Amino acid sequence: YNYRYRLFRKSNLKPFERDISTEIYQAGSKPCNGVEGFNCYFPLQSYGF
Amino acid sequence: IIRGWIFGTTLDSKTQSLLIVNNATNVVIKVCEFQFCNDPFLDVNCTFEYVSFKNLREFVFKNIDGYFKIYSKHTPINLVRDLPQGFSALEPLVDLPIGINITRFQTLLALH
Ligand SMILES: *[C@@H]1O[C@H](CO)[C@@H](O[C@@H]2O[C@H](CO)[C@@H](O)[C@H](O)[C@H]2NC(C)=O)[C@H](O)[C@H]1NC(C)=O
Ligand SMILES: *[C@@H]1O[C@H](CO)[C@@H](O)[C@H](O)[C@H]1NC(C)=O
Numbered sequence A: 001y002n003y004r005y006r007l008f009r010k011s012n013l014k015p016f017e018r019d020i021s022t023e024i025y026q027a028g029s030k031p032c033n034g035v036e037g038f039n040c041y042f043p044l045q046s047y048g049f
Numbered sequence B: 001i002i003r004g005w006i007f008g009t010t011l012d013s014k015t016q017s018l019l020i021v022n023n024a025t026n027v028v029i030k031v032c033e034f035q036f037c038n039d040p041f042l043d044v045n046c047t048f049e050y051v052s053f054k055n056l057r058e059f060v061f062k063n064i065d066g067y068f069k070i071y072s073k074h075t076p077i078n079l080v081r082d083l084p085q086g087f088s089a090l091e092p093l094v095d096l097p098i099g100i101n102i103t104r105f106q107t108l109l110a111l112h
């Protein structure tokens, strides 16, 4: 699980955009405020290699 | 008095930011999260790094395809305050593949 990717959050990256951020991902537009559940989840997903 | 610039989106360690400084001996550049100067005064995990009224310094700062692009010119001037009414072309300086893109910026100033 050291190998990781984004699912969604918001709008796409621009070409060669170096994203580094680690704030909570929205599945929906709630005030997620560091709480996971419905609407809100961790900003990295990781491979079962 | 003007020593450099800060560029980014949050400028506060939530994400990476571009720092450009002239230290009188050199020009020095980094992209980093942390703020040595959190506020624009300067005393008289970084993913990229680089080194190199009477006078008017002109710059164009421009940002495309993850490159940051700079053009410049110098001249002495004699107008009371304003940019002199006239024409002279700025020339390319550097073209840095930093991968950041910018919504907000600020300048840095030397103080006692
Ligand atoms: C690049 O600029 C964008 C704005 O155009 C910054 O904003 C986020 O960009 C990501 C894509 O990486 C989107 O998912 C978000 O919706 C954007 N949010 C906002 C508030 O616009 C982005 O932070 C900048 N990235 C870098 C690396 O500088
Ligand atoms: C590097 O900075 C980003 C924010 O810009 C942060 O999320 C990350 O945790 C930092 N790297 C390490 C190894 O902690």
Ligand SMILES: *[C@@H]1O[C@H](CO)[C@@H](O)[C@H](O)[C@H]1NC(C)=O
Residues within 6 Å of the ligand: B023, B025, B026, B028, B051
């Ligand atoms: C200016 O920056 C360069 C490169 O980091 C460094 O070698 C030099 O000592 C600095 N000069 C001053 C006056 O801090």
